[PDB]
């Protein structure tokens, strides 16, 4: 397959992270985040889209109070508030970035229909040809991978899909697009501005943060 320019947008570990494609799609995503954020920042517009009787699988708009921006999100679970049985806590998967967060319904709206047009931008991947140094990944390995990818800071990488692995049985709530048996792409990654001929897997192995195979 062909190499592709990507950003790493979220990281759980070197064998669970998310990438976005750079190009017209990433420009459209940035434009959409701006437009959704401007639109839903108005109480009047939010009232046009009040959330009622939400359901698992629903695609919604949600504000992440971190950056105060509005994002497309998939409801992956709904549970009662523990303090308060008459309200729910909503498990959201942020379809364009890869993050998952538990969010109050107060911070969610229905998604205006035209915001559905853009392809969901995040693809879950694993780093091919590596495994953990200790038989889970050490926090230091996760940190090194976050550093090399500069996750969430718009660092261009070159990715290539070189293998696939069957998704394991999930132990937590995940996207409807990420069920057991579906193919998880295994990628090579390298930083074209890196000063190195080695890809990120080989950097992690040669520097003691991962093992081969």
UniProtKB/Swiss-Prot annotation:
Domain of life the protein comes from: Eukaryota
Effect seen on changing residue 146 to A: Decreased binding to piwi
Knocked-out gene: effects: RNAi-mediated knockdown does not produce a visible phenotype. However, fertility is reduced with egg-laying decreased by 30%. AGO3 protein levels are decreased and AGO3 is delocalized from the nuage. No effect on nuage morphology and no mislocalization of piwi and aub. RNAi-mediated knockdown in germline tissues results in delocalization of AGO3 from the nuage.
Substitution effect: residue 97 to A: Decreased binding to unmethylated piwi
Localization: Cytoplasm; Nucleus; Cytoplasm, Cytoplasmic ribonucleoprotein granule
Domain Tudor: 53-118
Effect of residue 66 to A: Decreased binding to piwi
Tissue: Ovaries (at protein level). Expressed in the ovary and testis.
Mutagenesis / variant outcome for changing residue 71 to A: Significant decrease in binding to unmethylated piwi
Function: Involved in the piwi-interacting RNA (piRNA) metabolic process, which mediates the repression of transposable elements during meiosis by forming complexes composed of piRNAs and Piwi proteins, and governs the methylation and subsequent repression of transposons which is essential for germline integrity. Likely to act by recruiting Piwi proteins such as AGO3 and piwi to the piRNA biogenesis machinery in the nuage. Required for the final steps of primary piRNA biogenesis by participating in the 3' end-trimming of piwi-bound intermediates into mature piRNAs.
Subunit structure: Interacts (via C-terminus) with AGO3 (via the N-terminal region when symmetrically methylated on arginine residues); this interaction is RNA-independent and may be required for AGO3 localization to the nuage. Interacts (via Tudor domain) with piwi (via N-terminus). Interacts with tral and me31B.
Family stated for the protein in its record: Belongs to the Tdrkh family.
Domain notes: The Tudor domain is sufficient for binding to the N-terminus (1-14) of both unmethylated piwi or piwi symmetrically dimethylated at 'Arg-10'. However, it may not be sufficient for binding to symmetrically dimethylated AGO3, instead this interaction may require a larger region of the C-terminus which includes the Tudor domain (257-576).
Protein name per the record: Tudor and KH domain-containing protein homolog
């Amino acid at each position: 397959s062909k190499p592709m320019e990507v950003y790493v947008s979220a990281v759980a570990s070197p064998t669970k992270f998310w990438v976005q494609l750079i190009g017209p799609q990433s420009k459209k995503l940035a434009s959409m985040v701006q437009e959704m954020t401007s639109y839903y920042s108005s109480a009047e517009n939010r009232a046009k889209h009040v959330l009622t009787a939400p359901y698992v699988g629903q695609i919604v708009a949600a504000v992440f109070k971190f950056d105060e921006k509005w994002y497309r999100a998939e409801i992956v679970d709904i549970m009662p508030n523990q303090y308060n049985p008459k309200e729910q806590v909503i498990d959201l998967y942020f379809v364009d970035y890869g993050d998952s967060e538990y969010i109050s319904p107060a911070d969610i709206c229905e998604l205006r229909t035209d915001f559905l047009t853009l392809r969901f931008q995040a693809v879950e991947c694993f780093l091919a040809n590596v495994k953990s140094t200790i038989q889970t990944w050490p926090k230091s390995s996760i940190a090194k991978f976050e550093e090399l990818t500069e996750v969430a800071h718009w660092r261009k990488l070159i990715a290539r899909v070189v293998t696939y692995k069957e998704r394991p049985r999930a132990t937590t709530a995940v996207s409807a697009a990420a069920k057991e048996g579906t193919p998880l792409p295994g990628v090579e990654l390298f930083d074209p501005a890196d000063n190195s001929e080695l890809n990120i897997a080989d950097l992690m192995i040669t520097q003691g943060f991962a093992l081969p195979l």
